[PDB]
Amino acid sequence: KSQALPFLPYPENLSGYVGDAGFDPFRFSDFAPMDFLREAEIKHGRICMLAWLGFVAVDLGARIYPLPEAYEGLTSVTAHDALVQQGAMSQIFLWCSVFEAISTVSVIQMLYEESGREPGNFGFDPLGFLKGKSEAEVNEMKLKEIKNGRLAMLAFSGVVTQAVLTQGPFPY
Amino acid sequence: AFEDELGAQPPLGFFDPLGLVADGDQEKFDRLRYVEIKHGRISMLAVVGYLVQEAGVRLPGTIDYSGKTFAEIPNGFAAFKEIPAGGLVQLLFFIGVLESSVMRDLTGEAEFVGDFRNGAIDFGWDTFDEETQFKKRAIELNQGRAAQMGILALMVHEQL
Amino acid sequence: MRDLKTYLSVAPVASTLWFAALAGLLIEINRLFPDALTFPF
Amino acid sequence: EMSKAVPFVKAPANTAGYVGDVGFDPLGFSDYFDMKWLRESEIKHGRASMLACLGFVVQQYITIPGYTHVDDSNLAPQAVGVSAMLQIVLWMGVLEFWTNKGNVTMETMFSSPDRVPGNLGFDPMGLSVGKSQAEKDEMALKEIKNGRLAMLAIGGMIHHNWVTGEPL
Amino acid sequence: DISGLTPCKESKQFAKREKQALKKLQASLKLYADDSAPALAIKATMEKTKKRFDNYGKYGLLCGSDGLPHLIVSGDQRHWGEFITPGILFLYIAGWIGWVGRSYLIAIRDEKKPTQKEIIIDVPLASRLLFRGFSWPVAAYRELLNGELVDAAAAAAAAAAA
Ligand code: CLA
Ligand code: CLA
Ligand code: CLA
Ligand code: CLA
Ligand SMILES: CCCCCCCCCCCCCCCC(=O)OC[C@H](COP(=O)(O)OC[C@@H](O)CO)OC(=O)CCCCCCCCCCCCCCC
After folding, report:
1. DSSP string, A79-142
2. Chain A nearest CA to C4, separation (Å)
């Protein structure tokens, strides 16, 4: 009954979600609450979309203009260890962790005690892309977000592997 | 659908190959146009900058009190990195007061830019012709639309 | 999670948190102002 | 239903009739503690910060005769001693007992049906006397906001010098 | 001085203790190379040790023939930092705890289940009470001359004897 794997039964929990495909062979959906799993895949995707592009811009060649002197002569493989010696990575960790302590409050209010917030919606639409859209357009955008989120998880995973194997130009 | 708007001039008419105001939202056109008009003239002042600068026309005198003169300054992207560190701050400051002063004019998306008589000079909206403004604002947009491709030339025809 | 909060309010959990915060209070003060036999400092 | 400030956690209850209300309480302190005490705290933390933001800046350039000019405000107590410092804080105490007619704890304060937060009775000049309610609400929004700016300020002024060793 | 003691900055035996404590750490330092972690640790230990002797020398403490600091608790005001001033400090914190803890028991007493709130703390209520003991010498004094500090003799159960 599964659309991805037609020799499997349908996993009986994936119904109602934006990306469906019937793809859950190991059946984590019967174990974990299905709002919580969609949280992760949205958050895992959104980091990897920024991590892919962010990891490349610095290797195609693009750096910040003021240049503290600590960001000199560093590729992205080396740019983790020299920076934590500077204080950049100790900071971004702080302001991420500020947002995560708020998000911890939100995810417990959603899973248990009924916030009604969507798995990955933080109300962040300054430019109004979805306002006025019907359900056929909101479900399409959300769908587009995960796909590119799904593509970028596998894309980034290779390229950090590819770069440490063959240390060189951005194409590896 | 989205025709008879500002600056859709015919050598083409309806410049939308890939559905960008329609699949944007209800309104991104109101963002996009505000967004476009600002990009057009920063390119214009870049084009009118980079050309008049290249002819060697300089301001007579020094730029600071330590004796750096304007005529000691070549061009390209090599001139922003030459004007001193404090000299760049006062550039950016009463620019950064004015993306604050113009974005917040009690309406954001209804009126466009927040016209150049915000500071030191004062604007009249009452003298307001219906027919005259359609051509003149569509010259102005389309001057910048070519100027963006023109400044994209001289920024990229330096590196190669 | 009002039941985990009542679990965090039970006496042995509050005692270890209070002591952990209070031992580390004394350790930190002895790290910056060590060897204070008396007020002489 | 949801918070105005941060619109992905639930709106905090029992913060409605207060001046700087934008629904910002993600850790839920107003659920657990009395709201009149929390407001009175926030105003007092703000007023001490606003006086310390003037102080930290004006102390570099003005110094009263008899004292020693100190390059960094932070090093001033060392340049004034301890006797002068204790006189300040012990008189602050006496000014605080008289302030709230002797009700100085979190159990004795706000035991009268009068005694609203931040109303000291202090108004020698007559600023905001006999005016309407909207104007009064507007001027109370200014004292909170400038006090909140000054708290995060007086951190930075004090902190800047901690690392470095020279004035502002 | 008092008891035939000498101040520590002028004690010949206190100075010998300082030298021998440093010599012991220097002879341990010589077996390591200069940039390594054991050499930096022992160098920091000799700084901590040297600052410990300097601190006492100017401290104003009294030494004996043994070369060790002694403390004077007669009540002299000149040796206050030794017992009085840390004594007043402890009394402030110990009387703060006893007062605050007692406020808690008296508060949850008038209730269906007082015993329930001793194994499972009403933290919002407890947190409030903990910081009200900053002015305990005034609060313990108001209840003494009220009648709410000590109970009457006909309210305490007593052993058959008396
Ligand atoms: C292609 C990826 C993609 C897509 C389709 C979406 C789609 C969506 N996001 Mg989302 N998001 C993404 C990436 C994406 N996001 C990333 C990477 C992050 C992390 C910063 C977020 C963080 C985020 C939050 C926090 C929230 C959303 C929300 C939303 C929804 C409403 C906003 C919207 O449509 O804007 C997307 C519209 C687009 C046209 C995508 C922008 C494409 C960019 C501009 C491409 C350019 C790349 C790069 C910037 C180029 C720079 C130049 C380079 C050379 C350096 C919608 C479903 C909101 C939501 O769920 O409400 C329903 C919400 O609260 N997103
Ligand atoms: C092991 C040793 C030890 C030590 C050293 C302490 C020490 C302390 N305990 Mg703990 N405790 C201990 C063991 C110990 N405890 C044990 C074994 C138990 C049994 C489990 C407890 C149970 C316990 C309880 C229940 C409580 C404490 C509390 C306290 C504190 C009371 C004094 C205080 O709050 O600061 C001193 C504070 C002041 C002097 C402030 C003065 C008053 C203000 C208004 C003046 C403002 C001046 C101004 C800010 C100055 C700035 C001016 C500027 C110009 C410089 C203190 C830090 C109390 C506490 O934590 O407080 C909330 C408390 O409730 N203790
Ligand atoms: C996973 C995300 C991620 C992480 C962890 C890092 C981490 C790092 N980057 Mg990097 N970067 C990223 C994404 C990321 N980047 C992206 C997406 C871009 C393209 C815009 C860049 C472009 C970039 C440059 C040009 C440089 C770095 C540098 C660095 C290093 C120092 C921090 C710094 O200067 O940040 C600078 C970061 C930026 C300029 C971009 C941050 C944009 C954030 C992550 C996304 C925007 C968030 C926002 C909510 C989205 C909506 C806003 C909307 C208006 C667009 C550090 C290792 C510097 C370095 O040392 O290189 C060796 C450096 O010079 N990065
Ligand atoms: C709660 C808010 C807060 C914060 C964020 C700070 C932050 C700071 N204060 Mg500060 N301060 C505060 C409240 C605060 N203070 C208060 C209320 C007071 C009393 C009024 C002071 C009094 C004070 C003084 C008097 C001074 C400071 C100084 C400093 C700075 C020193 C940084 C530091 O400690 O290194 C943080 C340490 C690290 C980042 C090292 C960690 C490195 C390793 C690799 C990380 C891994 C180890 C990890 C921590 C262990 C994990 C934990 C475990 C549970 C797993 C820093 C900006 C001083 C300063 O700037 O001097 C430098 C200075 O003069 N402050
Ligand atoms: C040099 C400074 C001395 C000047 C004293 C200033 C007097 C303060 C004004 C009194 C309030 C008058 C207003 C209404 C008058 C009124 O009714 O309020 C009296 C006030 C308590 O009032 P209430 O009873 O209304 O408060 C609530 C009570 O019912 C408790 O539930 O108690 C005091 O006055 C304390 C005065 C300070 C006492 C200072 C003595 C110092 C003792 C500290 C001991 C240190 C111990 C160290 C550790 C060992």
Report:
1. GGHHHHTTTHHHHHHHHHHHHHHHHHHHHHHHHSS-----TT--S--TT-SSTT--HHHHHHHH
2. 12
